[PDB]
Enzyme design. Structure first.
Site, PDB file in Angstrom:
ATOM      1  N   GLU D 759       0.804  -1.040   0.281  1.00 23.95           N
ATOM      2  CA  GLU D 759       0.325  -0.187  -0.207  1.00 23.95           C
ATOM      3  C   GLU D 759       0.613   1.751  -0.102  1.00 23.95           C
ATOM      4  O   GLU D 759       1.055   2.336   0.716  1.00 23.95           O
ATOM      5  CB  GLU D 759      -1.001   0.105   0.765  1.00 23.95           C
ATOM      6  N   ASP D 760       1.793   1.172  -0.887  1.00 24.20           N
ATOM      7  CA  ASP D 760       2.092   2.853  -1.303  1.00 24.20           C
ATOM      8  C   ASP D 760       3.165   2.522  -0.880  1.00 24.20           C
ATOM      9  O   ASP D 760       4.424   3.656  -1.290  1.00 24.20           O
ATOM     10  CB  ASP D 760       1.187   4.276  -1.550  1.00 24.20           C
ATOM     11  N   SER D 761       4.301   1.892  -0.160  1.00 25.92           N
ATOM     12  CA  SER D 761       5.654   1.515   0.797  1.00 25.92           C
ATOM     13  C   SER D 761       6.986   1.580   0.519  1.00 25.92           C
ATOM     14  O   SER D 761       5.938   1.007  -1.078  1.00 25.92           O
ATOM     15  CB  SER D 761       5.042   1.334   2.826  1.00 25.92           C
ATOM     16  N   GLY D 900       5.823   7.675  -1.653  1.00 24.42           N
ATOM     17  CA  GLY D 900       5.671   6.191  -0.575  1.00 24.42           C
ATOM     18  C   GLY D 900       6.067   6.990   0.202  1.00 24.42           C
ATOM     19  O   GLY D 900       6.703   7.769   0.320  1.00 24.42           O
ATOM     20  N   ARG D 932      -2.374   2.237 -11.254  1.00 24.33           N
ATOM     21  CA  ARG D 932      -2.629   3.795 -11.333  1.00 24.33           C
ATOM     22  C   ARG D 932      -2.119   3.634 -12.991  1.00 24.33           C
ATOM     23  O   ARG D 932      -1.865   4.583 -13.189  1.00 24.33           O
ATOM     24  CB  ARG D 932      -0.523   4.130 -11.054  1.00 24.33           C
TER      25      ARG D 932
END
Ligand SMILES: [Zn+2]
Ligand SMILES: [Zn+2]
Ligand SMILES: [Zn+2]
Ligand SMILES: [Zn+2]
Lengths: 116, 48, 66, 1131
Positions: D759-761, D900, D932
Site C-alpha cells: 500500500e504505496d510504501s 510513498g 495506477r
DNA sequence: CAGCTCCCTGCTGGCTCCGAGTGGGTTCTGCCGCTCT
RNA sequence: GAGGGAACCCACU
DNA sequence: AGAGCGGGGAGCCAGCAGGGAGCTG
C-alpha cells in the site's frame, strides 16, 4: 415567404399596417406624421416553423478560402465544374437536427454552394 | 445620550443618538445583518 | 554537490574516480569507455559517476565568509 | 534545402535551444515589469488631471517627466548607498528604487501674469524593483559578477524583495476587454445577453461594462434593452440610439442591421422599436435615461447633462471618450445589437467563457499599474487637500510638505507584502493571493511559482467549467500541472514556450490601415457594410475593407518581417462572419509556431546551420522571427490556423487528411510546463499521475539555489548528493535541472519482499542510507530584533541572569554568549535558547522574552548574522542545521506519481541481491503499478538500466518515435541482461533464488519535504486556549487533536457513551459551575468561605454543583449576554 | 346589479447552507497627527 | 516548568 | 519638548399584490 418592413418617406421612420374600410384595402400609415402608403402585399405578419429548409442564404461563399475547412474532390461544382470543393455542416441551433454537408466551390469567383 | 437627555437638547440629535445606540447594540449581537454598515476596527477588519 | 565516497548500492570506492573520469572525458573517451577504464563494471557504480552533478565547483565561486 | 526527417529532431531541438537561449523562462514577468516601469508609470502620471486650486489666486499643478533611480538604501545617517539584493534579503529591507517626478507650479494672480516654479525631480515614493529586471542592480551582470555579489546566476529573477521576503506576482486571468461576448443567461429574464468589458487602451482606468440584453418570451415579441453603466434600470436600445442623436429609423437600423433584404433581423428589432415608439427626440431620450440614473435630477437640464456625460465618458469608453464620436460609438452599439440578433437567431454561436481568446492575463505590469493609478490618485488628493488648506488662509504652500511620500511607498509595499491587492482600508473586498511568498524549496518550485496563472474564481464553486482542461490551453498552459484539492483547474502553469504579450501601441497599424484602402466608419454609407469585411483594432471597429485576402496577406507579410506590425500583434480573420480583428493589447498568451506554406516548412537547413554556431554568427531566435520562419500565434489566431503536429504531417498520405496546413508545431512536448517536463515518458503515464508528479516535484528535495549558504531562509532543504537523472527529457536542459537536480538514481526492485512495501510504501536499504543515500540537511532560520517600544519597554540582546530577569521558560542560558546570542557550532535542542532578549518593565525589572528553538528539533547553529534593520535596531538571524537521515515514514517519490513512505529499512545482507551482488536501494510494491497505470515508471527503469550500462544519458522526451520499449529491450539484451529488465534475485535471508524474476533497474527517486519527524505529534496535557479553555492548535503549540463532529457520530454509532464523555468532557475542558436550584442561572460561589449566593432569587441554601464543558459555560454566558436565559433546571 | 369583501395563486425579496483533519509561512494589530510646556 | 489573536497564502491525506 | 493620549451558487419561506368567487343594500 417573409415580407419586409415598410419605411416612411417623409419622417424617415417605420410604417405600420392599417385597414382603411373606405376602399376596404390595406395601407402602410406612418404614425409620427400624416404619411400614408398603399400596400403591394397583403401579408403583414408571417412566421416559419418547419420552413428552415434553406440554409444556403446564411452561407457566404468566402468560406472556400478557410484553411481549416475540409476540401474534397468527389463533389464537383455544377456552375463551373471545378474539382475542389469545401464541405462543412450548418452550425446553428436550428441545424442541430441535421448533419447535412453544405459544399462551397473552392475556385475563385464561382461561389456556388450546394447540398448532397 | 444621557447627557443630551439630561442637559436638554433638541429632538434632531436625540434621534441620531437613539439610532446610533440601536446600531451599536444590534452590531454587538448581530454584525452580519445586511443593508447596514458593518461595525469595523481601526484596522478595517469587521467586529466579531 | 561533491562526489560520494562510496557507491550507495554496493560500497565500491568512487570518491577517487571523479577527477580521473573528468580527465578521461576531456581526453575524448566516451562515457562508457571512461567508466570501463575506471573499473566500474556494475551499473550501480556507473550511475554513480555518470549521473553525478559536481556542484562544489560552483559553490567555490562564492568568496569565503570564514 | 528542406530538412530531411532524419535531421528533424536535431533541428527542432536546436531551434528550441535557441528560443531558450534568448527568451528564458521568466521572460514574461521581467517584460511586464519593464514595460510597467518605462511606459505605464509615466502614462499614469501624465494622464492624471492637473491640480487646479483656487480659494482668489489660482494655482495650477502639473506633473511631468518621471525619474527612477536604482535601488538605494538610506541608513539613519541619511547617506545613500547602492542596495544589493542579498543586503535586502538579510536586513529585511524592501528592494525599492526612489521615483522622482518633475512638478511645475504656475501662479495666477489678479491683474498679474503667471509664475512658473520648476520643482525638478521631486521624491514621491519608492517603487519596489523586480529582481533581474532592467532597473535592478543585477541587470547586465555576468555570472562572475553575480557570484561576486553572492547571487546565483541560475536564479531567474522575476520577483520582488519586500521586507526581506521574496514575493512573486501570480498572473490573473481577466476576461478580455473591448470584445462583444454573447451568452445565454441561465434561468434569467434575458434569453440572450451581450456584454462588452469596455476600457480605453493604454490608459489605466477601470473597465466600464455595458450589457445589451434580449428579454425572455415567457408581450408581442422579443425586446432588446441596454444595461448601461451608472444607469440603474434597463433602457431600451432604441432610446439609447435616440439619445446618441439619431431621430430616424433608417439611421438606427442601418447602424444595427447592415443588410436590408434580411427579414428576420427586422422581425426581431420590431418589438424593440415598437416598445420605444413614444420617445422620438434626442433630449427626450436623454431625459428618459437620466431619470433612472444613480443620481436623479429635479431639473431637466441636469438630467440632460447627466445622460450626456454617461453616454459620453462611461458608455463604451474604448471606441470614444471625446465629442463628435457619436457615429463610431453608435456603429459599435449597433454591432453589439447585431451580434445579439445573430446569436438569438442562431445564425452565430454563443461565446465560451473558458476560451483563452476571451481571456487576458494581468501580469506584474498591469497589476502594478492598477495599484499605482489608485495610489497616485490618492497622492494627488492629499496634495490638493494640503494646498487647499493652506490657500484657504495662508499665502503659499511649499510642495515638498504637500507630497506625502508614504502613499506610493507604503501602498506598494503593503500590497506586495500581504497579497491583498488594492487598498488596505478596503481589505475585505480586496483580492488576495495576487502576491505570494516565492517558493524556494527546489529550483522547480521557483520556476513553477514564477510561471503561475490564477483564475479569480472562488474555490468553493461546485460548477466545473472554469476548472475543466479547456481545449484552448494547448501549448499555452500546461495540461498536467495543477494543484490538487480546492484549487484544481484554477491555478495553472505556462507551457515552456508560451509567451504572454506585453502590450503595444495600436497607432502604426492604424496609419497603415488608413493608407491601405480601409474606408473609415465616419466616411461611409452603411449600405457598403453588408458585403465588406469589418476591421477591429483592439476591439475598436475602425472601418471596412473590400479585399480581405490581400489585406490579411499584407498584414501577415508585415508581421513576418518585423515591420509596422510587431511580432506579438494578433491578427484574426473570421471568414464566416466577415471580420478582421487586430489585438495589440497586453495579456494575450501566444506561442511560436513554424510557418508552413504550400505544404513545406519555411524553416530550412541554412537556419539550422546558422543556429548551430549561435556564439559566432550572432544568430539567435530573434533572427528566426525576422526571417519569416517562426510566428507568434495566440489563442484567437489559433482558431484560424491549421496546425501540423510534425513535418511528417505535411507529407502526402494515401488518405490525405489535410493539404492546407498553415503552421507546424516546433515540438509537441512544449505543451507541458516546467514541472511536467521533468517526467520521463509522460505519454506512457495516466494523466492523474502526471498531475501528481507535477505537484510532488515541487516538494522534492535537492539544491534549491546555488547560494544557499548566504541565504537565511525560514525553511531550507538541501540534499547531500543530488544526481542528474539518467533518463532525462530534452526539455530538462532549459529548466537547468542537470545543474540543480532534485533526486537520486536509485536501484529499484519492484518486488514483494517481506510485506513492508504494501500500500504505496517502499523498503529502503539501510546500508545505502548509511552511505549518504538521500541524506539531507534542514536549515531553519530564526529572526529577532531589539525593538524599542516607547521609553520603558526596551528589549535588548543581553545574556539573561535569573537574578534580574523574570518570565523564563526555565531553560539553561549557558550556551548563549555574553552578547545575548548563541554562536555557530553549538548543538541545540528543543528547549534550548538561541537568542537572549530581555525587556525592561516599569526586583524583577527585566522580563525574559528569549527566542527558543522549535520543539524536539535537534540541530547545530550553522550561522549567526547580526545587522541593523531599516529602523536602526539591532537585528539577528540564526540558521540552525539539522541533518535528516532517511527514516521509516519519510516520503519518497518517483517521477511518475509513485509517492510513498519508507516502511522498513533492511541492511545490505538482508536485501535481495542479483548474481552480481547488486542489492536494490529501494523496493516498491508491484501492486502500486496496475491500477495506477504508470508504465512510464517501468520504461524509465528499463531505459535507466540501458543508460547505466551503456554510459549514455537516456532520452525520454514524450513524443519520440526513435525511442520505444522494443528498442530499449534489444539494447538491454545487448549487455547480457534480460531484455525486459527482470533479474534473478536471491533471498537475502536464506540465499535461495526467488522463483519469480524481479524487475530491477535505476529509477530517479526524489525525497519529499514530508518527513515524519516534522509531523509526529503527541499530547498528554499542556497549553489550553485562553477563551474556551480547550487544548491548543497544532504541534507547534503543543496542541491537541480535534475530536470533530464525525468522530462524535462514530462514537455514537459505537454506543460508547463514556468514551464520548471522556473525549468531549474530561479530556478537553472539564469545569464545575454553581447553579441556583430555583432560577437555573449560574450563581456566585465563594468556595473558600463556602458562601454560595444567587442574586435574583436571594438564594443561599439551594445551590447545586454542576459539571459541564467550559465551552458550555462560555456558550451559556454568551447567551445571557444575548438576553437569553438558559435556565439549567436540575429537576 | 354595482361595488365591496374575502380568500386562492403569482411574484419578488430575504435568508441560510456550502467534507473531515493536518503541517508550514508572512502580514496585520497600531496610525497618525496633535496640545501642553 | 509555562504569555497573543486575526487575516491570508501554500501544502498534506 | 518629547512623552503621552485621542479620534458565487443553490433552494425554501414570507409578505404583498393580482385574480376569481360571493355577498348585501
Ligand atoms: Zn412618417
Ligand atoms: Zn464552381
Ligand atoms: Zn556500486
Ligand atoms: Zn436563582
Amino acid at each position: 415567404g417573409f415580407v419586409g418592413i415598410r419605411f416612411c418617406q417623409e419622417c424617415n421612420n417605420m410604417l405600420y399596417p392599417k385597414e382603411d374600410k373606405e376602399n376596404r384595402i390595406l395601407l402602410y400609415a406612418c404614425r409620427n406624421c400624416d404619411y400614408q402608403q398603399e400596400a403591394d402585399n397583403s401579408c403583414i405578419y408571417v412566421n416559419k416553423i418547419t420552413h428552415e429548409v434553406d440554409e444556403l442564404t446564411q452561407i457566404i461563399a468566402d468560406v472556400s478560402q478557410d484553411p481549416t475547412l475540409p476540401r474534397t474532390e468527389d463533389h464537383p461544382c455544377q456552375k463551373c465544374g471545378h474539382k475542389e470543393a469545401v464541405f462543412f455542416q450548418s452550425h446553428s441551433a436550428r441545424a442541430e437536427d441535421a448533419m447535412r454537408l453544405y459544399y462551397v466551390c473552392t475556385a475563385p469567383h464561382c461561389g456556388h454552394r450546394w447540398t448532397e | 445620550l444621557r447627557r443630551n437627555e439630561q442637559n436638554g437638547a433638541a429632538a434632531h440629535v436625540i434621534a441620531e443618538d437613539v439610532k446610533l445606540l440601536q446600531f451599536h447594540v444590534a452590531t454587538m449581537v448581530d454584525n452580519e445583518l445586511p443593508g447596514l454598515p458593518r461595525a469595523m476596527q481601526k484596522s478595517g477588519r469587521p467586529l466579531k | 554537490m561533491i562526489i560520494p565516497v562510496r557507491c550507495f548500492t554496493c560500497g565500491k570506492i568512487v570518491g577517487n574516480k571523479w577527477e580521473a573520469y573528468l580527465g578521461l572525458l576531456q581526453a575524448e573517451y566516451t562515457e562508457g569507455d571512461a567508466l570501463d577504464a575506471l573499473g566500474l563494471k556494475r551499473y550501480c557504480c556507473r550511475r554513480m559517476l555518470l549521473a553525478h552533478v559536481d556542484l562544489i565547483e560552483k559553490l567555490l565561486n562564492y568568496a569565503p565568509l570564514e | 534545402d528542406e530538412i530531411t526527417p532524419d535531421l528533424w529532431q536535431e533541428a527542432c531541438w536546436i531551434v528550441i535551444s535557441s528560443y531558450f537561449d534568448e527568451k528564458g523562462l521568466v521572460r514574461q514577468q521581467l517584460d511586464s515589469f519593464d514595460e510597467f516601469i518605462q511606459m505605464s508609470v509615466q502614462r499614469i502620471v501624465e494622464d492624471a488631471p492637473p491640480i487646479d486650486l483656487q480659494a482668489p489666486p489660482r494655482y495650477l499643478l502639473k506633473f511631468e517627466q518621471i525619474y527612477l533611480s536604482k535601488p538605494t538604501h538610506w541608513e539613519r545617517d541619511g547617506a545613500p548607498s547602492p542596495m544589493m539584493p542579498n543586503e535586502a534579503r538579510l536586513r529585511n529591507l524592501t528592494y525599492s528604487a526612489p521615483l522622482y517626478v518633475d512638478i511645475t507650479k504656475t501662479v495666477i494672480k489678479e491683474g498679474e501674469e503667471q509664475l512658473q516654479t520648476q520643482h525638478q525631480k521631486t521624491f514621491i515614493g519608492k517603487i519596489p524593483i523586480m529582481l533581474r529586471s532592467t532597473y535592478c542592480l543585477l541587470n547586465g551582470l555576468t555570472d562572475r559578477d553575480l557570484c561576486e555579489l553572492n547571487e546565483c546566476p541560475l536564479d531567474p529573477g522575476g520577483y520582488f524583495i519586500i521586507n526581506g521576503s521574496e514575493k512573486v506576482l501570480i498572473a490573473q486571468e481577466k476576461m478580455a476587454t473591448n470584445t462583444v461576448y454573447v451568452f445565454a443567461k441561465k434561468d434569467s429574464k434575458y434569453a440572450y445577453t451581450g456584454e462588452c468589458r469596455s476600457c480605453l487602451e493604454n490608459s489605466s482606468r477601470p473597465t466600464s461594462t455595458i450589457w445589451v440584453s434580449m428579454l425572455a418570451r415567457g408581450a408581442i415579441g422579443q425586446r432588446i434593452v441596454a444595461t448601461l453603466p451608472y444607469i440603474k434600470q434597463e433602457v431600451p436600445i432604441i432610446i439609447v440610439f435616440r439619445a446618441l442623436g439619431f431621430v430616424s429609423d433608417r439611421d438606427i437600423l442601418e447602424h444595427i442591421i447592415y443588410d436590408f433584404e434580411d427579414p428576420e433581423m427586422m422581425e426581431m428589432v420590431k418589438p424593440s422599436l415598437d416598445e420605444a415608439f413614444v420617445i422620438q427626440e434626442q433630449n427626450v431620450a436623454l431625459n428618459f435615461i437620466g431619470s433612472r440614473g444613480a443620481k436623479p435630477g429635479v431639473t431637466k437640464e441636469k438630467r440632460i447633462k447627466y445622460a450626456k456625460e454617461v453616454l459620453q465618458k462611461e458608455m463604451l469608453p474604448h471606441v470614444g471618450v471625446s465629442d463628435f464620436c457619436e457615429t463610431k460609438k453608435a456603429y459599435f452599439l449597433g454591432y453589439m445589437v447585431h451580434r445579439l440578433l445573430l446569436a438569438a437567431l442562431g445564425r452565430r454561436e454563443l461565446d465560451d467563457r473558458d476560451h483563452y481568446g476571451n481571456k487576458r492575463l494581468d501580469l506584474a505590469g498591469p497589476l502594478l499599474a492598477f495599484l499605482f493609478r489608485g495610489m497616485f490618485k490618492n497622492l494627488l488628493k492629499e496634495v490638493r487637500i494640503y494646498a487647499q488648506k493652506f490657500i484657504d488662509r495662508g499665502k503659499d504652500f511649499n510642495l515638498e510638505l504637500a507630497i506625502k511620500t508614504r502613499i506610493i511607498s507604503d501602498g506598494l509595499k503593503y500590497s506586495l507584502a500581504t497579497g491583498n491587492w488594492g487598498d488596505q482600508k478596503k481589505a475585505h473586498q480586496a483580492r488576495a493571493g495576487v502576491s505570494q511568498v516565492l517558493n524556494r524549496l527546489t529550483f522547480a518550485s521557483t520556476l513553477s511559482h514564477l510561471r503561475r496563472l490564477n483564475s479569480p474564481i472562488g474555490r468553493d464553486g461546485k460548477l466545473a467549467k472554469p476548472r475543466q482542461l479547456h481545449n484552448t490551453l494547448w501549448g499555452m498552459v500546461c495540461p498536467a500541472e495543477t494543484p490538487e484539492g480546492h484549487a484544481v483547474g484554477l491555478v495553472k502553469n505556462l507551457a515552456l514556450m508560451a509567451y504572454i504579450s506585453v502590450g503595444s501601441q495600436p497607432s502604426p497599424i492604424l496609419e497603415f490601415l488608413e493608407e491601405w484602402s480601409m474606408e473609415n466608419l465616419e466616411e461611409i454609407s452603411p449600405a457598403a457594410i453588408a458585403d465588406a469585411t469589418k476591421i477591429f483594432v483592439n476591439g475598436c471597429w475602425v472601418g471596412i475593407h473590400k479585399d480581405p485576402e490581400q489585406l490579411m496577406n499584407t498584414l501577415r507579410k508585415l508581421r513576418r518581417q518585423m515591420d509596422i506590425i510587431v511580432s506579438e500583434v494578433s491578427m484574426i480573420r473570421d471568414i464566416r462572419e466577415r471580420e478582421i480583428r487586430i489585438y495589440t493589447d497586453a495579456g494575450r498568451i501566444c506561442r511560436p509556431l513554424l510557418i508552413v506554406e504550400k505544404q513545406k516548412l519555411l524553416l530550412k537547413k541554412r537556419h539550422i546551420d546558422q543556429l548551430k554556431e549561435r556564439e559566432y554568427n550572432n544568430y539567435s531566435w530573434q533572427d528566426l522571427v525576422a526571417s519569416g520562419v517562426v510566428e507568434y500565434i495566440d489563442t484567437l489566431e489559433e482558431e484560424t490556423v491549421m496546425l501540423a503536429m510534425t513535418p511528417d504531417d505535411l507529407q502526402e498520405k494515401e488518405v490525405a487528411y489535410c493539404s492546407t496546413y498553415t503552421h507546424c508545431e516546433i515540438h509537441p512536448s512544449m505543451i507541458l510546463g516546467v514541472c511536467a517536463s521533468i517526467i520521463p515518458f509522460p505519454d506512457h503515464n495516466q494523466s492523474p499521475r502526471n498531475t501528481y508528479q507535477s505537484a510532488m516535484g515541487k516538494q522534492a528535495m535537492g539544491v534549491y539555489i546555488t547560494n544557499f549558504h548566504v541565504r537565511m531562509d525560514t525553511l531550507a532543504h538541501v540534499l547531500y548528493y543530488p544526481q542528474k537523472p539518467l533518463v532525462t527529457t530534452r526539455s530538462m536542459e532549459y529548466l537547468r535541472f542537470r545543474e540543480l537536480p532534485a533526486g537520486i538514481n536509485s536501484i529499484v526492485a519492484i518486488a514483494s519482499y517481506t510485506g513492508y512495501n504494501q500500500e504505496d510504501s517502499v523498503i529502503m536499504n539501510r546500508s545505502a542510507v548509511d552511505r549518504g543515500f538521500f541524506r539531507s540537511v534542514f536549515y531553519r532560520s530564526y529572526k529577532e530584533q531589539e525593538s524599542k517600544k516607547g521609553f520603558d519597554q526596551e528589549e535588548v540582546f543581553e545574556k539573561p541572569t535569573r537574578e534580574t530577569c523574570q518570565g523564563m521558560r526555565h531553560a539553561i542560558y549557558d550556551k548563549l554568549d555574553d552578547d545575548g546570542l548563541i554562536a555557530p557550532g553549538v548543538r541545540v535542542s528543543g528547549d534550548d535558547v538561541i537568542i537572549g532578549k530581555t525587556v525592561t518593565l516599569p526586583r524583577y525589572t527585566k522580563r525574559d522574552c528569549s527566542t527558543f528553538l522549535r520543539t524536539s528539533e535537534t540541530g547545530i547553529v550553522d550561522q549567526v548574522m547580526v545587522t541593523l534593520n531599516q529602523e536602526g535596531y539591532k537585528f539577528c538571524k540564526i540558521r540552525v542545521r539539522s541533518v535528516r537521515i532517511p527514516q521509516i515514514g519519510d516520503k519518497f517519490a518517483s517521477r511518475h506519481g509513485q509517492k510513498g513512505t519508507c516502511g522498513i529499512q533492511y541492511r545490505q545482507e538482508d536485501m535481495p541481491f542479483t548474481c552480481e551482488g547488486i542489492t536494490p536501494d529501494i523496493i516498491i510494491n508491484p501492486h502500486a503499478i496496475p491500477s495506477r497505470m504508470t508504465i512510464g515508471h517501468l520504461i524509465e527503469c528499463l531505459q535507466g538500466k540501458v543508460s547505466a550500462n551503456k554510459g549514455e544519458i537516456g532520452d525520454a522526451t514524450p513524443f519520440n518515435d526513435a525511442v520505444n520499449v522494443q528498442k530499449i529491450s534489444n539494447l538491454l539484451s545487448d549487455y547480457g541482461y534480460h531484455l525486459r529488465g527482470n533479474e534473478v534475485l536471491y533471498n537475502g535471508f536464506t540465499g535461495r533464488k526467488i522463483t519469480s524474476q524481479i524487475f530491477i533497474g535505476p529509477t530517479y527517486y526524489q525525497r519529499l519535504k514530508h518527513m515524519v519527524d516534522d509531523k509526529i505529534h503527541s499530547r498528554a496535557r499542556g497549553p489550553i486556549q485562553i477563551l474556551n479553555r480547550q487544548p491548543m492548535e497544532g504541534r507547534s503549540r503543543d496542541g491537541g487533536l480535534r475530536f470533530g463532529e464525525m468522530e462524535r457520530d462514530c462514537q455514537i454509532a459505537h454506543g460508547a457513551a463514556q468514551f464520548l464523555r471522556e473525549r468531549l468532557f474530561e479530556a478537553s475542558d472539564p469545569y464545575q459551575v454553581h447553579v441556583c436550584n430555583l432560577c437555573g442561572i449560574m450563581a456566585i460561589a465563594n468556595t473558600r468561605t463556602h458562601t454560595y449566593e444567587c442574586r435574583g432569587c436571594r438564594n443561599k441554601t439551594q445551590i447545586s454543583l454542576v459539571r459541564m464543558p467550559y465551552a458550555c459555560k462560555l456558550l451559556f454566558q454568551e447567551l445571557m449576554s444575548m438576553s437569553i436565559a438558559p435556565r439549567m433546571m436540575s429537576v
